[PDB]
């Protein structure tokens, strides 16, 4: 996260770290959506241009964390993966369209002060909140600058951007399964996701029922926190029918 701040304790209890077993390293962010299911970006698990194709036993998920590198004894919980599900129409060849994946855990994780699931949006919550100017919140342990790494989880609040502005900022083909967020050069605030934040959540707090909803997944960008560039996020509601199909079939 570039130009964010340290998270408060328990601020994002749905935050998940995807952790590579060997070498031991941060792979990506992710989020907890139930006691057995974790949501992330497909490109965290599968991206052939970079020879990335992880299998279940390559990875762990670490839940309840705050410190990036510490083993947070008595606080974090470490879970093994039962099965990875990548969207069948994830477009890794072109533009990361449908950049979404689910992971089922081998055993349910116990909820605590530090571990709690986020909600997924309904159509009405999405329609109400996914509007230009409305701000969401992005969290992660990724790089602090494009060109180092944080001691603890970082947070930044960013406004959703008008779709024509998103489109005019990039040469990548945007789709309805994406949205973009960030400040404009004029606005005098900044902030962005960066490498290592992939797969983490873009959340919004509904003013109707005071619950946090995950509206996006950190997906792609051109650099980090560049003027005139924006971060792009998987549109979680647009892909919710797939999410539900997987959980109904396999949960």
């Amino acid at each position: 996260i570039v130009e964010g701040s340290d998270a408060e304790i328990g601020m994002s209890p749905w935050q998940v770290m995807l952790f590579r077993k060997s070498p031991q390293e941060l792979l990506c962010g992710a989020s907890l959506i139930s006691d057995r299911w974790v949501l992330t970006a497909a490109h965290c698990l599968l991206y052939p241009p970079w020879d990335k194709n992880f299998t279940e036993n390559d990875l762990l998920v670490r839940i309840g964390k705050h410190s990036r590198t510490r083993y947070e004894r008595n606080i974090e919980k470490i879970s093994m993966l039962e099965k990875i599900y990548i969207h069948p129409r994830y477009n890794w060849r072109e533009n990361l369209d449908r950049d979404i994946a689910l992971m089922k855990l081998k055993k349910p994780v116990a909820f605590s002060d530090y571990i709690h699931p986020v909600c997924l949006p309904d159509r009405e919550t999405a329609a109400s909140l996914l509007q230009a100017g409305y701000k969401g919140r992005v969290t992660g342990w990724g790089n602090l600058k494009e060109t180092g790494q944080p001691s603890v989880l970082q947070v930044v609040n960013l406004p959703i951007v008008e779709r024509p502005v998103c489109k005019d900022s990039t040469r990548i083909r945007i789709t309805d399964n994406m949205f973009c967020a960030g400040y404009k050069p004029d606005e005098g605030k900044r902030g962005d996701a960066c490498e290592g934040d992939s797969g983490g959540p873009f959340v919004m707090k509904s003013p109707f029922n005071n619950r946090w909803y995950q509206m996006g997944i950190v997906s792609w960008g051109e650099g980090c926190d560049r003027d005139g560039k924006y971060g792009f996020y998987t549109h979680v509601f647009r892909l919710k029918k797939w999410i539900q199909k997987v959980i109904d079939q396999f949960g």
Binding site: F19, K21, Q24, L26, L60, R62, T69, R70, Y71
Partner: peptide, 11 residues
């Protein structure tokens, strides 16, 4: 630069 995690999780 990651602290070792308990061996049980790497089993």
């Amino acid at each position: 630069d990651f602290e070792e995690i308990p061996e049980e999780y790497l089993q």
